[PDB]
Amino acid sequence: IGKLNMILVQILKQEWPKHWPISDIVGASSLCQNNMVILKLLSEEVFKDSMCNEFSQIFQLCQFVMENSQNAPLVHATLETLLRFLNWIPLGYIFETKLISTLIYKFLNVPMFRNVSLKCLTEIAGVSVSQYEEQFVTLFTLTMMQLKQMLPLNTNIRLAYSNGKDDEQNFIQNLSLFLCTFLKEHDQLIEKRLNLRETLMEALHYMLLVSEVEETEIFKICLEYWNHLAAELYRESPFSTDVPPRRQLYLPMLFKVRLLMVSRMAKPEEVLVVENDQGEVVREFMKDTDSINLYKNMRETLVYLTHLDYVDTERIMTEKLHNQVNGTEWSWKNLNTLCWAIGSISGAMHEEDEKRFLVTVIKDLLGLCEQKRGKDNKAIIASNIMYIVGQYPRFLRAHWKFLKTVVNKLFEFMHETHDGVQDMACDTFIKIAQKCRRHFVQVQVGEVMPFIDEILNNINTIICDLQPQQVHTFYEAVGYMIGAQTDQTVQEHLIEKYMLLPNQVWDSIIQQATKNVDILKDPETVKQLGSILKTNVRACKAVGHPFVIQLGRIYLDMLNVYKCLSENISAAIQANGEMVTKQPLIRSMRTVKRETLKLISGWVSRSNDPQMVAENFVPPLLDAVLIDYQRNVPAAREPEVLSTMAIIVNKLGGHITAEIPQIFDAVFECTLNMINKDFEEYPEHRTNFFLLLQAVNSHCFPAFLAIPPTQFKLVLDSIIWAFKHTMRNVADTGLQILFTLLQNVAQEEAAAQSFYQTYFCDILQHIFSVVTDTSHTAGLTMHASILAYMFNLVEEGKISTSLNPGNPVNNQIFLQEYVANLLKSAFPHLQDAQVKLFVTGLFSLNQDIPAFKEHLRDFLVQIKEFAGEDTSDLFLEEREIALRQADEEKHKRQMSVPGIFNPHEIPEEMCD
Ligand SMILES: *[C@@H](CC(=O)NNc1cnccn1)n1cnc(-c2cc(C(F)(F)F)cc(C(F)(F)F)c2)n1
């Protein structure tokens, strides 16, 4: 039978609404199950209004069979088929006939059909129309009356699911789905009925009970429902906490919802230390895409619920915590979840209320800590307390004494030997310093000297046990702390003391190399240089422009080291082969080179005085890098060279234009040959290459007129290869570069005319080739813009030269028959008059980009329809725009609700 199903599937793929526009349903008039399975298969071959009215033929027979047949397998199959086709069957059939009553009385109460029957009702609940309001109300009230008998509220759904059979678990899931969907789409319908409120409480009670099922999927469904309900009630009246109607109706059970939320809170990402299944405390090692989304939903729900009632949230939390300190419920799981909840509602709340809540929370946590002696408990408590103080910079910035105590204890934790406590401490140290910079540098109340100095004077001891990654983390934190010091005369000394330890190591290594360069081949020396350069990169990332004070100190030695490592690795590769790059020592040297380039790129991207950058830093970099990049084989070419060139060109523009020819002489031709041959070989080099090309085109276009034309040929060839590419991102970048290049070249007279005569027809031919080929339909707007631009330039007469070399002819007419011939070649079946009309319209629309786009799209769509080809992807950008608009709207809404985003996530950093 499988072969028949596959053959029918393939036949359906061959344009069902054209080749087979439902007739087989007649055969069901013992065989009905075969029909139902066939349509079940068809239900996924279907992806608007695909002649959907003929689904009524399915529904009529389904009602007939449903109303009259007792064959349980057949009933199940028919119910499944209807479950699929409720997405399209006309509404005037489902809501008018005996359907709802028929299955709610005849099947929903029967185990053989319970799950499918409830799923069918879920799909009916999924219909979202203002019509049939009374039928929806009847559906919900009757379904509740049924499932009340079938699953009484007194049942402990947690236990029933945990020990329940597979079908029972599926029934619990389907009940959750039905309740969630129906209340989402019709709660206002139910709430408007005074007498039904008790049944609404029954639904809410079911939601509470089913929310306690452990399995992640069930709780995800319940959480989505709770998120919807909380959002709706919050938006009913978000400014206060008399009660509005809906909130008044839901309040009698909101408390249980908050208790559920706090009890079951998922792990935040910032918590590195977790309890392992074997009963021990360890650092986290894996992540799940489910966890992040579940945590985000959990945070949304709980922040909405807190906005609904602040006092009650405080009460709940403070009581759970008072309980766990008392030892009534002491357990790492409970404390972890409670502290995750305490940190998750960070923000929101209010200022004085947050202070009041956190004072008691910190007191209770400290006492709990001071009571538990076991090392595992001491780690769990420390981790949780770190998470709390990490998520509440608002509290810290108002209490200097506590902030200093937290920082000192965090340093004490940095020495703690436990697996993940050090990482927790350093990550929290960033989260503190980043969001509380000014307090560290400004002399606070009572103290004599800024806290940054107590850090720097003891930095070596503070970093006397850290893993190198944690060392870079800590240096980045200190970098943020210094970065806020506005006084340059003090910031320079702070930087010098700040960098003093790695600068000492650097000076030692440089002195050793000067005495003998062979030291650079020692793996330990290379590793230390890599660590120092990573520290410098992170410090530059933090401090920003003032980092030049440190950078200029070591710049020349850094480039000398780069040259020495370049020579070493190049000689090694030349002597022993390309695979030499795989050796750990060679990889470490390449890491040193990569970090040098990254440091320069990082500093330049934040520099604000391009003149001095061009004068001092650029020429040594070019001398040290370009020849190496040209000479090395692909296996040893650093893509960070291209990235740095992109960044430097972007920042400097006209100040570096004179150097562009050399850069292209060294890089361009060498790198291009690596990209073209095989697409996947060097994705990073490809990306950095097109970044460089876009930057130089945008900010240093005159360079293209300086380089020899034989190489500008390669530039245009690379751009054309770029937009003809298959992958979306590279094609988009190619189109952007092409359009910018046209705009730029339009401004230089002789260059404009020569470029037109040499390439205009080639570029147009390639653009129409890609458009007709449709291989990159997503960029059709850019294609329309480019085509319109060229059509305008020719139409306005700005192309003074005759495009045809051999024929004295008008440019407009010439381009007209040229594009007509091109279109005819692409699609030989097009008629002459059709193409003539299309080209005349297209030319007439050169002045209006949206109109041009829609004209071209309509022409291409009718070509597809002649070919019978799918037109869905030809509107892909529009649908993508819709998705982006929806996402941006959601983001816009979330920022309006305090607490949904972490204090370390909002761009709107409050003062201090
Ligand atoms: C409790 C253990 C402790 O802090 N001190 N025990 C002593 C004191 N004197 C002599 C002998 N033993 N404990 C565990 N964790 C914390 C704690 C952690 C943090 C954080 F920054 F790491 F999150 C901060 C603080 C605070 F509130 F700043 F004190 C305490 N305390």
Curated annotation (Swiss-Prot):
Effect on the protein of changing residue 395 to A: Partially abolishes Ran binding activity and does not abolish nuclear export complex formation. Abolishes Ran binding activity and nuclear export complex formation. Abolishes Ran binding activity and nuclear export complex formation
Modified residues (Phosphotyrosine): 295
Residue segments, region Interaction with HIV-1 Rev: 641-661
Region (Interaction with Ran and nuclear export complex formation) residue spans: 180-291
Outcome (variant: residue 394 to A): Enhances Ran binding activity and does not abolish nuclear export complex formation. Abolishes Ran binding activity and nuclear export complex formation
Tissue: Expressed in heart, brain, placenta, lung, liver, skeletal muscle, pancreas, spleen, thymus, prostate, testis, ovary, small intestine, colon and peripheral blood leukocytes. Not expressed in the kidney.
A GO term from the CC aspect: nucleoplasm
UniProt GO molecular function: DNA-binding transcription factor binding; nuclear export signal receptor activity; protein domain specific binding; RNA binding; small GTPase binding
Region annotated Necessary for HTLV-1 Rex-mediated mRNA export, chain positions: 1-520
HEAT repeats: 70-93, 94-130, 207-313, 356-394, 401-438, 443-480, 616-654, 726-757, 758-795, 843-880
Interaction with RANBP3: annotated span: 252-322
Keyword vocabulary terms for this entry: Acetylation, Cytoplasm, Host-virus interaction, mRNA transport, Nucleus, Phosphoprotein, Protein transport, Repeat, RNA-binding, Transport
Family annotation (Pfam families): CRM1_C (PF08767), CRM1_repeat (PF18777), CRM1_repeat_2 (PF18784), CRM1_repeat_3 (PF18787), IBN_N (PF03810), Xpo1 (PF08389)
Keyword Endoplasmic reticulum: no
Protein name, per record: Exportin-1
